[PDB]
């Protein structure tokens, strides 16, 4: 599913926010 990018991309990206 898309909830992988919403956990993989989400975990590497939130780090920036």
Partner RNA sequence: GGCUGGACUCGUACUUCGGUACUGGAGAAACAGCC
Binding site residues, RNA, CB under 7 A: 1-15, 17
Residues near 14 by beta carbon (within 8 Å), at least 6 away in sequence: none
The token pair that represents 9 in the structure block: 């991309």
CB of 10 to RNA, least distance (A): 4
Tokens of 3: 């909830």
Tell me how far, at minimum, the Cβ of 16 lies from RNA, in Å.
Answer: 8
CB of 17 to RNA, least distance (A): 6
């Amino acid at each position: 599913t898309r909830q992988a990018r919403r956990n993989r991309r989400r975990r590497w990206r939130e780090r920036q926010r």
